[PDB]
Amino acid sequence: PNFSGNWKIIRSENFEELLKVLGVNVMLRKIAVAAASKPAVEIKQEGDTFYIKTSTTVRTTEINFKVGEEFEEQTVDGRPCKSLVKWESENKMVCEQKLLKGEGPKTSWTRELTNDGELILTMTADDVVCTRVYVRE
Ligand SMILES: CC(/C=C/C=C(\C)c1ccc2c(c1)C(C)(C)CCC2(C)C)=C\C(=O)O
């Protein structure tokens, strides 16, 4: 049950559709979609403590959190939110997000370590689901 490692993406689907439901104009979606197809992901895990750095040419995010403890991060479209991660199963964590200001689509994410050694990340916005699959570099 160790997510630690440097991960590279091998499959991504419905990412643009995700941004579309968030109301991002076409020009910006193009820039985001292009850069998001080549992320560099670093994860450091110790017990329930996580450090996840996701880097792209146009944006880098770093989150630090303890499963079960509320923290603050940003939605995919850059809006400040309060998040809470819980273990849904032994190798699957689910995160429920809550906007700090205003309204918007219900968003969340999940990260799961599969039995073949891969990592599946799913990001949701209302009914749209983006699936991203990684493998260690
Ligand atoms: C890599 C990844 C996600 C990458 C997302 C990127 C780059 C992204 C997302 C949204 C945006 C931008 C970039 C830029 C900066 C163009 C500004 C416009 C908005 C609409 C605010 C997820 C993962 O795989 O964990």
From Swiss-Prot:
Keywords: Cytoplasm, Endoplasmic reticulum, Isopeptide bond, Nucleus, Retinol-binding, Transport, Ubl conjugation, Vitamin A. All-trans-retinoate binds at R132, V133, Y134. InterPro entries: Calycin, Fatty_acid-bd, ILBP, Lipocln_cytosolic_FA-bd_dom. It comes from the Eukaryota. It is found in: Cytoplasm; Endoplasmic reticulum; Nucleus. This is Cellular retinoic acid-binding protein 2. One of its GO terms (biological process) is epidermis development. Belongs to the calycin superfamily. Fatty-acid binding protein (FABP) family. Gene3D superfamilies: 2.40.128.20. It comes from Homo sapiens. A motif (Nuclear localization signal) lies at residues 20-30. Interacts with RXR and RARA. Interacts with importin alpha. One of its GO terms (cellular component) is cytosol. Induction: By retinoic acid. The keyword Ubl conjugation applies. There is a cross-link at K101 (Glycyl lysine isopeptide (Lys-Gly) (interchain with G-Cter in SUMO)). Transports retinoic acid to the nucleus. Regulates the access of retinoic acid to the nuclear retinoic acid receptors. Forms a beta-barrel structure that accommodates hydrophobic ligands in its interior.
